[PDB]
């Protein structure tokens, strides 16, 4: 008989034909999927009085467990089944309610913002409902649905109730972002943005995806804080971190100016103890709202290579040492410039100084390399200055050894960040990066949490899916929607600290990047390691930068340039194509295809809405939702395995069936040269920076040990092609 129990807890008789119908429905259009195979595996686990929800979970998992490279279409079979179960779970039926009724109910329950009902009329919601296509939920993959259900869809985390479906999320994010638009164009934009996000052309960050439409206003994910050399600034920095990590933001801290251990105690401020103690205080601030003082909340601290305590700073995450000299739960970014690299090449020494003892040096390091060398050589000979000399080879090897063993000791080439940038280094120099090393914005130290003369950088992100466009001229529409939606967001969100508001309203900085790069290269028949993708990469990143500046320029015409537009190089008629590292000319010969000189003039005359537009970030979740390869990285394998409460999550790279031999997997690359050239070509056009990785496989080297020579050679190649920063170092576990 097999009794089935329902949601109200009432008994009906099992209906095996109904189940089969759903399976047959879900399978429509898929290849190599056996409905019988799924029925055999799930029916055996049924029993008298099994709830209906449990039947749904059982068949979902059955299909999920058959996902493989040989039958990738199980990804969709499981997904559709999952979508079906979520529909019934939220609406009690498959067919979603009308938009207007849904929004009314959610506003009354306190789950949606009430401004939605004030900002749009019932007729306008009826119009919006005709845009929605609920059948687009049938295009997700199983792993995507799991992320949607896990961290995007509005739900009751305690009771496990899901209140909405993907398409209401997409339509309402659009509705909120363009709510302040004139009624003559408002809904035309709403429809276009909804089409772009629901068909995976534009990806949005997690915070936006889960919050916009709900009553919250906290959407910042990266804050850049610069700390001055004083107890008041140390306290302000610390207070600012606590406020921002409680809202789940990644922090990027510049603590380079703090004077060295021993330096003259100046003002009562016991700076006799040096950097370490204060670094430990920033670590506890970063972990202040973390479970058991270690999980959640992250930061990357930056310091110059010539700091007098650099040798103690470089081994802070070494897992072998006294607790009083170790700050293990933060990542560090070392700041280098051309002079430092020269000393290494010539086999000379590097002189270490405390920032407080060398007037003008620290600022010169970022804004003027000629003045840096002048001051640096002067102070080397000045006998009144406290200093220390170390062999450049020793310092560079100590740094690289720590980078290699932890993977988390990053590099920032400060000269490249200021000679090739959107900002004028005399007025607004770039002095640090963020958590994942792709943001590069100007900052100013605070003397108090509420100091209005300080500046904290924030950046709003998003990305273009290179696997969902047919030709590069589709980026014109996409760039308009991406820029307009994110610029609206800058006025929509809250700012807990005055200095953060200042930078956002002054410069209106954005960071739009790409996902699915590997897939894109595979379908064009190119690889990473042999130089075959150089010209296509050049051509592709010229289109992205060109259309992003165009959209921003059009927006400034309409609504005015950003208040501090005059501090940008763009304001003086200087473009990315005028300041790139000239060595790039030897590795790419593609011509420019767009009219940059027409654009040059327009920017000069009407200005830009946003000071920065592009940045290439990492991405795990966004890419999962659109079944795309992460950011610009090569896949580690054809199938991704992730752990979940419900089971093992598998995801097959896009179009594996036809492109398995076209892909070039991470550990198939012979080395980092090909990849480092592509990053250099991308950096010619990007406003900010890229999260570049370096990868090494021990089994490709004699005795299973990566030679220091190879590590330093790749460091220098990166520098030669204009790479601004370097993120993770991946070493193989084989």
């Amino acid at each position: 008989n097999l009794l089935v129990t329902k949601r109200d807890g009432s008994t009906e008789r099992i209906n095996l034909d109904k189940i089969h119908r759903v399976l047959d429905w879900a399978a429509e259009g898929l290849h190599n999927v056996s409905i019988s195979q799924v029925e055999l595996r799930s029916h055996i686990q049924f029993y008298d009085g099994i709830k209906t929800s449990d039947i749904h979970e059982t068949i979902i998992k059955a299909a999920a467990d058959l996902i493989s490279r040989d039958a990738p279409d199980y990804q969709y079979l499981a997904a559709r089944l999952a979508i079906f179960h979520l529909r019934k779970k939220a609406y009690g039926q498959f067919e979603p309610p009308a938009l207007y009724d849904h929004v009314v109910k959610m506003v009354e329950m306190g789950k949606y913002d009430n401004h939605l009902l004030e900002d749009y009329t019932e007729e306008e919601f009826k119009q919006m409902d005709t845009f929605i296509d609920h059948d687009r939920d049938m295009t997700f993959s199983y792993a995507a649905v799991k992320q949607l259900e896990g961290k995007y869809l509005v739900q009751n985390r305690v009771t496990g109730e899901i209140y909405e479906s993907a398409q209401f999320l997409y339509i309402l994010v659009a509705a909120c972002l363009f709510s302040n638009y004139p009624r003559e164009t408002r809904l035309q934009y709403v429809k276009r943005f909804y089409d772009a996000v629901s068909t995976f052309k534009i990806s949005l960050p997690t915070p936006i995806m889960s919050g916009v439409r709900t009553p919250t206003r906290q959407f910042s994910s990266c804050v850049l804080i610069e700390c001055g050399d004083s107890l008041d600034s140390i306290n302000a920095t610390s207070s600012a971190i606590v406020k921002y990590v409680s809202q789940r933001a990644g922090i990027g801290i510049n603590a380079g100016r703090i004077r060295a251990l021993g330096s003259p105690i100046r003002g009562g401020e016991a700076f006799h103890t040096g950097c370490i103690p204060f670094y430990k205080h920033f670590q506890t601030a970063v972990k202040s709202c973390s479970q058991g003082g270690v999980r959640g909340g992250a930061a990357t601290l930056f310091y110059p290579m010539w700091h007098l305590e650099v040798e103690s700073l470089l081994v802070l995450k070494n897992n072998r040492g006294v607790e009083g000299n170790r700050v293990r739960h933060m990542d560090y970014g070392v700041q280098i410039n051309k002079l430092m690299y020269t000393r290494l090449l010539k086999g000379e020494d590097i002189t270490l100084f405390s920032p407080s003892d060398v007037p003008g040096l620290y600022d010169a390091f970022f804004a003027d390399q000629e003045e840096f060398e002048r001051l640096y050589t002067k102070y080397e000979k000045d006998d009144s200055i406290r200093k220390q000399r170390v062999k450049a080879v020793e310092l560079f090897s100590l740094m690289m050894q720590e980078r290699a063993s932890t993977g988390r000791i990053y590099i920032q080439n400060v000269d490249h960040c200021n000679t090739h940038s959107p900002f004028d280094p005399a007025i607004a120099p770039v002095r640090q990066s963020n958590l994942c090393l792709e943001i590069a914005l100007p900052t100013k130290p605070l003397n108090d949490v509420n100091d209005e003369n300080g500046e904290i950088a924030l950046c709003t992100l998003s990305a273009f899916n290179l696997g969902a466009i047919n030709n590069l001229d589709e980026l014109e529409e996409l760039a308009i929607l991406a820029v307009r939606a994110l610029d609206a967001l800058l006025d929509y969100q809250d700012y807990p600290i005055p200095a953060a508001k200042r930078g956002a309203m002054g410069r209106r900085t954005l960071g739009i990047g790409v996902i699915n790069f590997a897939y894109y290269l595979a379908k064009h028949g190119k690889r990473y390691s042999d130089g075959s993708a150089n010209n296509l990469t050049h051509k592709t990143f010229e289109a992205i930068q060109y259309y992003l500046l165009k959209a921003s320029n059009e927006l400034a015409k309409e609504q005015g340039a950003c208040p501090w537009f005059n501090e940008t190089t763009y304001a003086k008629g200087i473009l990315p194509i005028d300041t790139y590292k000239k060595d790039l000319d030897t590795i790419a010969n593609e011509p420019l295809h767009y009219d940059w000189e027409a654009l040059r003039e327009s920017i000069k005359t009407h200005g830009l809405r946003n000071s920065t537009l592009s940045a290439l970030m990492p991405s795990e979740t966004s890419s999962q939702i659109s079944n795309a390869t992460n950011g610009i990285e090569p896949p580690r394998g054809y199938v991704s395995i992730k752990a979940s409460k419900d089971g093992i999550l598998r995801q097959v790279v896009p179009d594996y069936e036809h492109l398995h031999d076209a892909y070039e997997l991470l550990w198939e690359m012979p080395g980092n040269d090909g990849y480092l050239q592509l990053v250099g070509i991308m950096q010619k056009f990007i406003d900010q920076s890229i999260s570049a990785n370096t990868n090494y496989d021990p089994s490709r080297f004699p005795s299973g040990k990566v030679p220091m020579q190879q590590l330093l050679k790749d460091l220098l190649t990166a520098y030669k092609f204009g790479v601004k920063t370097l993120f993770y170092q991946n070493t193989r576990d084989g």
Binding site: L344, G347, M708, Q709, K720
Partner: peptide, 16 residues
């Protein structure tokens, strides 16, 4: 595992 052996004579030619 790394082999800490740097040849400064080999790196010197490099052009930044």
């Amino acid at each position: 595992q790394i082999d800490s052996e740097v040849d400064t004579d080999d790196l010197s030619n490099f052009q930044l």
